[PDB]
């Protein structure tokens, strides 16, 4: 990172690669979706899992698209 | 001599107005193209530690003396790299201060002129400015 | 009379620009903005009801 | 008399052992005075109190699983069948004067020991104190934390009451026997057969009073010796370098402070032991496999593991006529956690590429990625710990128990991600807050209206100024910046006297002048040392 | 600041008249006689405006005209220091979290949570009140 | 030459806090109008041998508080501390005297669940007592702040507004004492 983005960039670990966070988000979403497999008989929680996974996938996709298009760095 | 609705205040600042529904800025280019040029300027200047500037307007007859006159208006002009363009006279000028000499700008400034000229022949003014800034800043080192 | 400007004003502040302000601010302008944002989120919640 | 005796004994000691130079080296050793460097010795003092009270307890405890009929004073359990271990735990708390107090001080000291280890670990991790040359000593500490967890678990399993026996049946017996291929062999080696058997409590007792505490004592000795001879880290500040230690010598200041802190920690643990009930085992009854109670939590330092059991889904595999049950996941998970904790310094030097000697600490704001990672880890730890108490929380706070399970399950993925992002941005935000004071000085809070109507806040520069009067921007030096004018001395002092009556004005004047002169001399000494080096 | 006092005195006149009228009109030909809740509320609303108006009226007759009370004051009349205005603080959010802890404790009737919340409130309010008065650390 | 801003804010807030007691007075008078002739009803026996001395101690705490204010306006931090310590001790005595009255009332069968009179009596006097406890906390915090820095005009203003609150609490008690122990 540049010091304009992280002022103490030369004092410590200041950069995490974006691929790590994108892949971690996708894997976390997939893990939310795999907990639909279980013994539970209700589906309220299935909808909560689907919604949280959808929000995560949308955030990852927005970030990836905006980095590709150059709007954020 | 002040525009309508503009006032000189007790601090020397100008307090201006716009008619409701009208714009303050009105540059004849799309907003997202202006954002792209702004990012090109900012991140080119950060990567080279030299302030990059762009001029659009009439450059006169010599057009290099005028460009050197305009460079005095860039902040910290000794460390600045100005690209001035006259769409009418169809002229491209690059002028830089002394702090930037010896940092890679003699190689990159003509490359910036070529990059601008290639896009101008297609009728793409802002695209030419963006491309030229990108090539010239990629060729200057923070030295 | 050439004043240097930016081609477009900055879209957002840098990273770290906002979050500590939000929890330490005594600026009535920022507090008013925070009120407007949170009140509108509550408006959406009540409208969903 | 008292001085001649000291000289005579000193000469007798020096003629026989000639220890003068080594002793003097110990007296002149310098320790930094930062408040957070006192976190490790809370753990040390808790361990010492545990040793003393535990030795007292072994004089009365019979760890036998032999079944007997209770013949003691506690009427609600008269005639009830119980082990000798539960019997003698009751005898300690009712038939030995001071036994209940000693037992409660022991258990509170165990809780403070685990909590101190956790907080001290957080300091080590967030300040970067694990970096070379100190990787091994982080590893030793990690082992100390694991051993403390299992030592406390074995300790509260000893009385063989219903609650702790329920904990033994599920965790020590159930998870173990679930282990693939070797699970049941490990169970029958540990228990001597099936649960509960007859050897478990005597064996755990031997592990708890001698074997594990001996390993812990050896590891603590190695740990403190490494700290002592590697010379404690310090924060950046005036006069502090990578090659020096700024602080106070052992004799007398650090010794007095350490002894007084030990006395105060002992006082707190003694007040807790005789003001707050912990583990009143007579209310629980003896352990019987047919009985159970609602609310089967372990001690807090084990809760996360229990929380993991509660949250992980019922995922099992049945390959070729065999069974891999759910608990295996938890076992693997625990190993993974421990392996990641022990290995962290080497992971970070592999990722960052930084393999330099480090004696100056990092402020947590200045290492935003590691601070975000540690905050993420603490968020996961807290979520698992509260998942373990999900049934209590459901009862007290009116949440569906099913809902708490699903909140823990989803939050186990979502809360660490949110916490990581927030902590990262918050750390960079504190960096920017420091930068602001560096360019503009300290905001004093005093607003002024200029003659033309401008409003300006007065700033106090931290360095030299311009001819225009604005401060010259200062460079960040890894050290904290003042942000309140009162912390720079702007408030002055009230006026010398008792709380109700003033002293004579001449006394006040002399005292104030002496205080200002001393403060200036101290600042000048640090400044000139810094200028020289 | 005579207008500031006058505003509250005018409100006071209306509130006192309304309180007297309501008490007298409900005592006569209203079922049960005096309606005590509304009468009490009107009397003490009158008291509220009376306290503030009397304070403003006493303050006004002390100090002579301020630049904001002067019809043709100049901007430069107001030059100088205004006072202290806190530049930043994270103590307000701590106070509100503490008070919300005590409130959740009172809602669910958990006396230990109420005790913890009250202790949190006292600590947070001390943190706010002392923030600009703690001296330097001493060593 | 200008209003004390902290003073005006404190006065404005105190006037608002009068409406909070308006609600409780409304509750009391509603329950009293529905009494049916017996007010206080049996077995409640109010005793003035103890309410009156506690009331007088609380009134005298106002004079001691005003003395502290005069010292603060004079710039005398030690006189302010002495008078505010005396005021704190007297208000603490008021709180303990009220608690003793409560204890003797509960043993004879006047409680919050027991009767409508007990409900209004205890909410009214107990919320006033909570206000007294808040004022004692305020005295403690103010006195600790005078030891933190030199005695400035802002510090004296803080003392003055704490006294405004204490006088409000005393006057509210006079009103509550008149309506409960004499306008029965
Ligand atoms: C395991 C890890 C799990 C990862 C989980 C993934 C989540 C995030 C994924 C992602 O995108 O990452 C980017 C993200 C950072 O990317 P970035 O580009 O630096 O930051 C984003 C930019 O600033 C640019 O962001 P932006 O352009 O979206 O700007 C955001 C902006 C505004 O926010 C938005 O733009 C929101 C957009 C959605 C809604 C907008 C409304 C319009 C409708 C949709 C828009 C269509 C276009 O907000 C603000 O900054 C200020 C606004 C304040 C909030 C106001 C909201 C009002 C609420 C009221 C409602 C009404 O990564 C993270 O930091 C995620 C943290 C979690 C990762 C943990 C990693 C640890 C792993 C350890 C290692 C072990 C493995 C080996
Ligand atoms: C549970 C809560 C506990 C924590 C949970 C997460 C907290 C995360 C906060 C954080 O990281 O700081 C913001 C953080 C910025 O962090 P930073 O490192 O300071 O980045 C600086 C930026 O460059 C931004 O730089 P800038 O300062 O130039 O940004 C200007 C502008 C940015 O403008 C935008 O991007 C557009 C904002 C969205 C449009 C609003 C929609 C329309 C609503 C009507 C508004 C009427 C006016 O943002 C503002 O001025 C917003 C000011 C007031 C925001 C409301 C604060 C609420 C305080 C209470 C909670 C604390 O925002 C992000 O980057 C991501 C957005 C976070 C997600 C939004 C919240 C979720 C939606 C509501 C909850 C739904 C579930 C219930
Ligand atoms: C570390 C070991 C802890 C020692 C014990 C703390 C006692 C406090 C002493 C104190 O205030 O002294 C002043 C002391 C600084 O005075 P100093 O002597 O000048 O320090 C020398 C250095 O220059 C000071 O360097 P600095 O100012 O750069 O470092 C302070 C701070 C600077 O902070 C940062 O670097 C970034 C801020 C990270 C915040 C994390 C986000 C939290 C999630 C928000 C919720 C979203 C939903 O760093 C940290 O706090 C690092 C630890 C982060 C742990 C937070 C985990 C949150 C998980 C909860 C999720 C629920 O301040 C601190 O050390 C702050 C302590 C922070 C509290 C610990 C976290 C609490 C965890 C339990 C939460 C329970 C939840 C229910
Ligand atoms: C808000 C934002 C989004 C957009 C705006 C609004 C969206 C929300 C709209 C949802 C509407 C739901 C219905 C409302 C009414 C209600 O109250 O419910 C009805 C009834 O329902 C249950 O009866 C089912 C039948 O009606 C009965 O006939 C049947 O018998 C019964 O059978 C069960 O029980 C039997 C024994 O009795 C067993 O025999 C049998 O096998 C079975 O188990 C049934 O139950 P069951 O299927 O369990 O549950 C299912 C119920 C239960 O309600 C529910 O919707 C559950 C609640 C869902 C909550 C959604 C969470 C959203 C995620 C978060 C936003 C993520 C985080 C992001 C935040 C900020 C992000 C910014 C950073 O319906 C549903 O899910 C409806 C389906 C659709 C839900 C919507 C999902 C949207 C998300 C997907 C997209 C992602 C978002 C995009 C991102 C970009 C019983 O309970 C009944 O009492 C109850 O009466
Ligand atoms: C039964 C029952 C009632 C209780 C059970 C017993 C129990 C649980 C504990 C009692 C034993 C115990 C822990 C005693 C504590 C005694 C202490 C710590 C006294 C210190 C008092 C004190 C500060 C006096 C002045 C001496 C000074 C200034 C310090 C000397 C000094 C001391 C005292 C250290 O402990 C010390 C430890 C580590 C390094 C250096 C020192 C050190 O130099
Ligand atoms: C705040 C918590 C208030 C606690 C109230 C309480 O528990 O008191 C009720 C109790 C009456 O209980 P009762 O069923 O009459 O039997 C009593 C036998 N000794 O005893 C009482 O009547 C207590 C009297 C009230 C005490 C003051 C409370 C102040 C009210 C502010 C709310
Ligand atoms: C029984 C448990 C432990 C005890 C009694 C203990 C005790 C201490 C003490 C007294 C110190 C020196 C003073 C200080 O900085 O606080 C210290 C330093 C240290 N501890 Fe621990 N510790 C324990 C566990 C741990 C853990 C869990 C870690 C980390 C995983 C750790 C790593 C370190 C390191 C790296 C140092 C030296 C730090 C420095 O110089 O600044 N220890 N320990
Ligand atoms: C790391 C150190 C230790 C920890 C964390 C620890 C923890 C515990 C705990 C939690 C208990 C249950 C207490 C209870 O009854 O309520 C216990 C019991 C016991 N511990 Fe320790 N202990 C430690 C060290 C020692 C040592 C060194 C001894 C022996 C000298 C000892 C002797 C005992 C005995 C005899 C009991 C059983 C009697 C009883 O429960 O009351 N402990 N321990
Ligand atoms: C620990 C048991 C005995 C403790 C007494 C020893 C310390 C006092 C003796 C020396 C100080 C006074 C001056 C003096 O007598 O000078 C000399 C004694 O000291 C020495 O030279 C050797 C002392 C080294 C031993 C210390 C080891 C541990 C002691 C630390 C205890 C806190 C004798 O003076 P002289 O010969 O008359 O010039």
Residue-by-residue DSSP string for A19-65: HHHHHHHHHHHHHHHHTTSSS---SHHHHHHHHHHHHHHHHHHHHHH
Resolution of the solved structure (Å): 2.3
The response to whether residue A31 sits with its C-beta less than 6 Å from ligand 4 reads no
D322 has binding-site annotation: no
State the Cα torsion F140-F143-F149-F154 to the nearest 10°.
100
Q: If we measure between CA atoms, which residue out of E129, E65, E53, E56 comes closest to residue E91?
A: E129
Q: Is the CB of residue B84 less than 8 Å away from at least one CB of chain C?
A: no
In chain F, how many domains are there?
1
Residue B134, classed as helix, strand or coil, is helix
Q: Closest chain D residue to A30 measured between Cα atoms? A: D413
Task: Tell me the count of C-D CB pairs closer than 8 A.
Answer: 25
What DSSP letter does each residue of D67-121 carry, written as one string?
EEE--SS-GGGTT-EEEHHHHHHHHHHHHSTTHHHHHHHHHHHHHHHHHHHHHHH
Q: In what order do the strands lie in the sheet with B51-56?
A: B51-56, B80-86, B91-96
**Two structure tokens written together for D219:** 């590891």
Residue D202 CA to ligand 8 center (angstroms) comes to 13
Find chain E residues with C-beta within 8 A of D486's C-beta: 132-135
Cα dist from C21 to B21, C12, C17, F75, whole Å: 33, 15, 8, 38
User: E35 CA to chain C: closest CA distance, Å?
Assistant: 36
Residue F118 alpha carbon, nearest atom of ligand 6: 22
Nearest C-alpha to atom 47 of ligand 3 is from which residue? Answer: D419
Q: Is the CB of residue B118 less than 8 Å away from at least one CB of chain C?
A: no
**What span, in angstroms and rounded, lies between the C-alpha atoms of D112 and D265?**
10
The 3-class SS string of D215-265 reads: HHHHHHHHHHHHHHHHCCCECCCCCCCCCCCCCEEHHHHHHHHHHHHHHHH
Q: Which residues, in sequence order, are CB contacts of F46 under 8 Å at separation 6+? A: F40, F180, F181, F184
> Which helix (H) or strand (E) element contains residue D523?
helix D505-532
Are E90 and C24 within 8 A, CB to CB?
yes
What residues are paired with D248 via a beta bridge? D31
Find chain D residues with C-beta within 8 A of F150's C-beta: 491-495
Q: Are F2 and E63 in contact (CB under 8 A)?
A: yes
Full residue range of the structural domain in which residue F71 is found: 5-181
Q: If we measure between CA atoms, which residue out of F93, F26, F34 comes closest to residue F61?
A: F93
Check residue D502 and report its DSSP letter: B
Q: Which residues, in sequence order, are CB contacts of E117 under 8 Å at separation 6+? A: E98, E99, E100, E101, E102, E103, E104, E105
Q: Are F27 and E46 in contact (CB under 8 A)?
A: no
In chain A, how many domains are there?
1
Please name the residues between 342 and 401 in chain D that touch chain E, using a CB distance below 8 Å.
396-398
The 3-class SS string of E94-138 reads: HHHHHHHHHHHHHHCCCHHHHHHHHHHHHHHHHHHHHCCCCCCCC
From the centroid of its chain, how far is CA D191? 32
Angle at D78 between CA D75 and CA D81, to 5 degrees: 145
Are A13 and D315 within 8 A, CB to CB?
no
The 3-class SS string of chain F reads: CCCCHHHHHHHHHHHHHHHHHHHHHHHHHHHHHCCCCCCCCCCCCCCHHHHHHHHHHHHHHHHHHHHHHHHHHHCCHHHHHHHHHHHHHHHHHHHHHHHHHHHHHHHCCCCCCCCHHHHHHHHHHHHHHHHHHHHHHHHHHHHHHCCCCCCCHHHHHHHHHHHHHHHHHHHHHHHHHHHHHCCC
The response to whether residue D63 sits with its C-beta less than 6 Å from ligand 8 reads no
Nearest C-alpha to atom 19 of ligand 8 is from which residue? Answer: D155
Cα dist from D405 to A52, A67, C27, D150, D188, whole Å: 16, 37, 41, 26, 33
User: C46 CA to chain E: closest CA distance, Å?
Assistant: 22
Q: Are F72 and F80 in contact (CB under 8 A)?
A: yes
Q: Are B133 and B37 in contact (CB under 8 A)?
A: yes
Q: Is the CB of residue E84 less than 8 Å away from at least one CB of chain F?
A: yes
Chains that touch B (3 or more CB pairs under 8 A): A, C, D
D88-121 burial, b at 16+ Cβ within 10 Å, e below that, comes to bbbbbbeebeebbebbbbbbbbbbbbbebbbebb
Using CB atoms, pick whichever of A14, A15, A48 lies closest to residue D406: A48
**What span, in angstroms and rounded, lies between the C-alpha atoms of E90 and E92?**
6
Q: If we measure between CA atoms, which residue out of E68, E121, E71 comes closest to residue E91?
A: E121
**What span, in angstroms and rounded, lies between the C-alpha atoms of D416 and D122?**
17
Residue D453, classed as helix, strand or coil, is coil
**Two structure tokens written together for D358:** 């480090």
Probe residue for ligand 6, chosen from F99, F117, F122, F130 as the CB with the greatest number of ligand atoms within 8 Å: F122
User: E77 CA to chain D: closest CA distance, Å?
Assistant: 8
**What span, in angstroms and rounded, lies between the C-alpha atoms of D93 and D102?**
9
Q: If we measure between CA atoms, which residue out of D43, D111, D124, D115 comes closest to residue D341?
A: D124
Full residue range of the structural domain in which residue A9 is found: 1-73
Q: Which residues, in sequence order, are CB contacts of B25 under 8 Å at separation 6+? A: none
Residue F139 CA to ligand 6 center (angstroms) comes to 27
Residue D364 CA to ligand 3 center (angstroms) comes to 8
Residue D364 alpha carbon, nearest atom of ligand 3: 28
Q: Is A5 exposed, middle or buried (0-12, 13-18, 19+ CB in 10 A)?
A: middle
Q: Are F116 and F34 in contact (CB under 8 A)?
A: yes
**What span, in angstroms and rounded, lies between the C-alpha atoms of F67 and F73?**
10
Q: What are phi and psi of F47, to 5 degrees?
A: -120, 125
Residue D8 CA to ligand 9 center (angstroms) comes to 8
Q: Are E17 and F10 in contact (CB under 8 A)?
A: no
The response to whether residue C39 sits with its C-beta less than 6 Å from ligand 2 reads no
Q: Which residues, in sequence order, are CB contacts of D10 under 8 Å at separation 6+? A: none
Ligand positioned closest to the Cα atom of F119: 6
Q: Are D510 and D504 in contact (CB under 8 A)?
A: no
First to last CA, chain B: 45
Give me the count of residues in chain F.
184
Alpha helices in chain C (DSSP H): 19-24, 28-48
Q: What are phi and psi of F80, to 5 degrees?
A: -60, -45
Residue D129, classed as helix, strand or coil, is coil
Residue F122 alpha carbon, nearest atom of ligand 6: 25
Q: Is the CB of residue E89 less than 8 Å away from at least one CB of chain C?
A: yes
User: D427 CA to chain A: closest CA distance, Å?
Assistant: 9
D427-451 burial, b at 16+ Cβ within 10 Å, e below that, comes to bbbbbbbbbebbebbbbbbbeebee
User: F74 CA to chain D: closest CA distance, Å?
Assistant: 15
Residue D197, classed as helix, strand or coil, is coil
Check residue D354 and report its DSSP letter: -
Query: What is the rounded radius of gyration, in angstroms, for the C-alpha atoms of chain D?
Result: 29
- Report domain extents, chain E: 1-139
Ligand positioned closest to the Cα atom of C14: 2
**What span, in angstroms and rounded, lies between the C-alpha atoms of D491 and D485?**
8
Q: If we measure between CA atoms, which residue out of D438, D278, D476, D497 comes closest to residue D362?
A: D476
- Mutation choice for D interface testing from A1, A12, A41 by most D CBs within 10 A: A12
Cα dist from D295 to D166, D286, D292, D388, whole Å: 11, 16, 9, 9
From the centroid of its chain, how far is CA D237? 25
**Two structure tokens written together for D499:** 């709380």
Instruction: Provide the greatest CA pair distance for chain F.
Output: 60
Q: If we measure between CA atoms, which residue out of D453, F130, F141 comes closest to residue E75?
A: D453
**What span, in angstroms and rounded, lies between the C-alpha atoms of B16 and D308?**
64
Q: Is E16 exposed, middle or buried (0-12, 13-18, 19+ CB in 10 A)?
A: middle
Find chain B residues with C-beta within 8 A of C4's C-beta: 53, 73-75
From the centroid of its chain, how far is CA F83? 17
Nearest C-alpha to atom 39 of ligand 8 is from which residue? Answer: D89
B98-119 burial, b at 16+ Cβ within 10 Å, e below that, comes to ebbeebbbeebbebbbebbeeb
Residue B133 CA to ligand 3 center (angstroms) comes to 44
DSSP strand pairing (B7-8 vs B14-15): antiparallel
User: F122 CA to chain D: closest CA distance, Å?
Assistant: 28
Q: Is the CB of residue C42 less than 8 Å away from at least one CB of chain D?
A: no
Query: What is the rounded radius of gyration, in angstroms, for the C-alpha atoms of chain B?
Result: 17
Neighbours of B138 (CB within 10 A): 14
Q: If we measure between CA atoms, which residue out of D122, D101, D96 comes closest to residue D42?
A: D122
Residue A51 CA to ligand 1 center (angstroms) comes to 16
Q: If we measure between CA atoms, which residue out of A6, A22, A20, A15 comes closest to residue A65?
A: A22
**What span, in angstroms and rounded, lies between the C-alpha atoms of F141 and E126?**
7
Q: Is D68 exposed, middle or buried (0-12, 13-18, 19+ CB in 10 A)?
A: middle
Q: Which residues, in sequence order, are CB contacts of D526 under 8 Å at separation 6+? A: D238, D239
> Which helix (H) or strand (E) element contains residue D194?
none
B49-77 burial, b at 16+ Cβ within 10 Å, e below that, comes to ebbbbbbbeebeeeeeebbeebbeebeeb
Q: If we measure between CA atoms, which residue out of D171, D54, D39 comes closest to residue D108?
A: D54
Residue E18, classed as helix, strand or coil, is helix
**What span, in angstroms and rounded, lies between the C-alpha atoms of D200 and D158?**
9
* Cβ contact B–F (≥3 pairs, < 8 Å): no
> What CATH number is attached to the domain comprising F122?
1.20.120.80
Check residue D512 and report its DSSP letter: H
**Two structure tokens written together for E44:** 């003490």
Find chain A residues with C-beta within 8 A of B43's C-beta: 73
Q: Are E66 and E1 in contact (CB under 8 A)?
A: yes
Chains that touch F (3 or more CB pairs under 8 A): D, E
DSSP strand pairing (D248-249 vs D442-449): unpaired
Cα dist from B12 to A2, B8, B15, D468, whole Å: 37, 6, 9, 18
Neighbours of D310 (CB within 10 A): 19
Q: Closest chain C residue to A6 measured between Cα atoms? A: C15
């Amino acid at each position: 990172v540049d010091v304009e983005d992280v002022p103490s960039a030369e004092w410590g670990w200041s950069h995490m690669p974006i691929g790590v966070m994108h892949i971690g988000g996708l894997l976390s979403a997939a893990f939310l979706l795999v907990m639909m497999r279980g013994n539970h008989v209700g589906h309220v929680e299935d909808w909560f899992l689907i919604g949280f996974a959808a929000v995560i996938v949308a955030l990852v996709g927005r970030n990836w698209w905006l980095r590709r298009r150059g709007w954020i760095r | 001599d002040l525009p309508y609705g503009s006032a000189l205040t007790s601090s020397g600042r100008i307090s201006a107005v716009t008619e409701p529904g009208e714009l303050s800025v009105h540059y004849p280019f799309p907003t997202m193209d202006l954002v792209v040029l702004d990012d090109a300027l900012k991140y080119g200047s950060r990567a080279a530690k030299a302030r990059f500037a762009v001029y659009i307007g009439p450059l006169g007859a010599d057009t290099a003396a005028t460009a050197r006159e305009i460079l005095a208006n860039v902040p910290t002009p000794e460390n600045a790299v100005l690209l001035a363009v006259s769409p009418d006279q169809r002229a491209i000028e690059v002028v830089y201060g002394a702090d930037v000499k010896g940092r890679g700008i003699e190689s990159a400034a003509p490359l910036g002129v070529s990059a601008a000229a290639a896009s101008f022949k297609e009728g793409n003014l802002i695209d030419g400015l963006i491309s030229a800034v990108r090539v010239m800043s990629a060729g200057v080192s923070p030295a | 009379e050439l004043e240097a400007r930016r081609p477009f004003p900055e879209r957002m502040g840098p990273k770290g620009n906002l979050i500590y302000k939000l929890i330490t601010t005594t600026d009535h302008k920022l507090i008013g903005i925070m009120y407007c944002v949170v009140c509108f989120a509550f408006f959406l919640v009540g409208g969903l009801m | 008399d008292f001085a001649k005796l000291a000289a005579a004994q000193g000469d007798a000691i020096d003629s026989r052992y000639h220890p003068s130079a080594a002793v003097r080296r110990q007296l002149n050793k310098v320790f930094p005075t930062h408040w957070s460097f006192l976190l490790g010795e809370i753990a040390l003092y808790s361990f010492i109190i545990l040793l003393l009270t535990g030795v007292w307890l072994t004089l009365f405890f019979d760890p036998s699983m032999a079944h007997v009929t209770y013949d003691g004073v506690y009427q609600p359990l008269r005639g009830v069948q119980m082990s000798r271990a539960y019997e003698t735990a009751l005898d300690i708390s009712f038939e030995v004067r001071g036994g209940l107090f000693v037992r409660q001080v022991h258990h509170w000291a165990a809780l403070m020991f685990a909590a101190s280890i956790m907080v001290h670990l957080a300091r080590i991790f967030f300040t970067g104190a694990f970096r070379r040359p100190r990787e091994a000593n982080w590893v030793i500490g990690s082992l100390l934390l694991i051993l403390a967890m299992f030592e406390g678990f074995f300790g509260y399993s000893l009385p063989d009451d219903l609650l702790s026996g329920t904990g033994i049946r599920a965790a020590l017996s159930g998870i173990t026997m679930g282990i693939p291929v070797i699970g049941t062999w490990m169970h029958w080696a540990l228990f001597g057969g099936d649960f509960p058997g007859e050897i478990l409590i005597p064996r755990l007792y031997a592990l708890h009073i001698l074997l594990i505490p001996g390993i812990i004592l050896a590891l603590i000795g190695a740990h403190l010796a490494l700290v002592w001879f590697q010379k404690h880290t310090q924060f950046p500040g005036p006069g502090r370098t990578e090659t020096n230690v700024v602080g106070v010598r052992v004799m007398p200041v650090f010794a007095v402070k350490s002894g007084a802190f030990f006395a105060m920690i002992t006082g707190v643990l003694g007040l807790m032991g005789g003001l707050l009930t912990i583990n009143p085992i007579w209310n629980l009854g003896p352990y019987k496999p047919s009985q159970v109670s609602a609310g089967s939590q372990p001690d807090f330092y084990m809760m996360w593991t229990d929380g993991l059991i509660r949250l992980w889904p019922a995922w099992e595999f049945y390959p070729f006529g065999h069974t891999i049950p759910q608990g295996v996941w938890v076992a693997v998970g625990m190993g993974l956690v421990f392996a990641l904790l022990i290995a962290y310094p080497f992971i970070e030097k592999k990722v960052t590429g930084d393999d330099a000697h480090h004696n100056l600490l990092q402020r947590p704001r200045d290492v935003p990625v590691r601070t975000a990672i540690g905050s993420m880890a603490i968020a996961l730890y807290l979520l698992l710990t509260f998942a373990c108490m999900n049934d209590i929380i459901a009862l007290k706070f009116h949440i569906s128990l099913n809902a708490t399970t699903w909140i823990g399950r989803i939050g186990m993925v979502v809360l660490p991600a949110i916490v990581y992002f927030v902590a990262y941005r918050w750390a960079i935000s504190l960096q920017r807050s420091d930068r602001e004071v560096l360019e503009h000085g300290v905001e004093t809070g005093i607003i002024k209206r200029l003659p033309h109507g401008a409003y300006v806040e007065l700033h106090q520069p931290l360095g030299p100024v311009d001819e225009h009067g604005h401060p010259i921007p200062l460079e960040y030096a890894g050290a904290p910046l003042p942000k309140r004018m009162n912390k720079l001395g702007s408030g002055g002092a009230p006026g010398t006297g008792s709380f109700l009556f003033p002293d004579p004005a001449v006394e006040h004047e002399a005292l104030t002048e002496a205080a200002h002169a001393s403060e200036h001399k101290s600042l000048t000494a640090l400044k000139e040392h810094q200028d020289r080096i | 600041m005579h207008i500031e006092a006058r505003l509250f005195e005018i409100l006071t006149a209306f509130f006192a008249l309304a309180a007297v009228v309501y008490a007298v009109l409900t005592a006569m030909f209203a079922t049960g006689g005096v309606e005590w809740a509304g009468t009490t509320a009107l009397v003490l609303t009158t008291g509220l405006t009376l306290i503030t108006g009397t304070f403003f009226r006493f303050v006004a007759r002390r100090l002579d005209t301020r630049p904001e009370d002067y019809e043709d004051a100049e901007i430069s009349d107001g030059a100088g220091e205004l006072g202290f205005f806190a530049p930043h603080s994270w103590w307000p959010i701590l106070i509100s979290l503490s008070f919300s802890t005590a409130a959740v404790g009172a809602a669910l009737w958990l006396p230990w949570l109420i005790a913890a919340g009250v202790a949190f409130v006292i600590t947070s309010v001390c943190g706010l009140v002392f923030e600009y008065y703690w001296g330097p650390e001493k060593h | 030459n200008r209003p004390n801003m902290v003073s005006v804010g404190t006065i404005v807030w105190l006037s608002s806090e009068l409406m909070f007691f308006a609600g409780l007075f409304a509750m009391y008078f509603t329950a009293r109008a529905q009494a049916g002739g017996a007010w206080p009803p049996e077995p409640t026996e109010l005793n003035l041998a103890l309410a009156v001395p506690v009331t007088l101690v609380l009134i005298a705490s106002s004079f001691t508080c005003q003395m502290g204010v005069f010292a603060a306006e004079r710039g005398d931090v030690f006189g302010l501390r002495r008078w505010y310590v005396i005021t704190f001790l007297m208000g603490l005595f008021f709180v303990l005297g009220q608690g003793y009255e409560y204890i003797h009332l509960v043993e004879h069968g006047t409680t919050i669940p027991g009767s409508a009179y007990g409900s209004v009596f205890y909410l009214a006097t107990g919320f006033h007592g909570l206000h007294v406890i808040g004022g004692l906390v305020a005295f403690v915090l103010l006195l600790a702040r005078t030891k933190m820095s030199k005695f400035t005009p802002a510090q004296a203003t803080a003392a003055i507004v704490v006294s405004y609150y204490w006088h409000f609490v005393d006057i509210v008690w006079i009103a509550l004492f008149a309506t409960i122990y004499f306008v029965r």
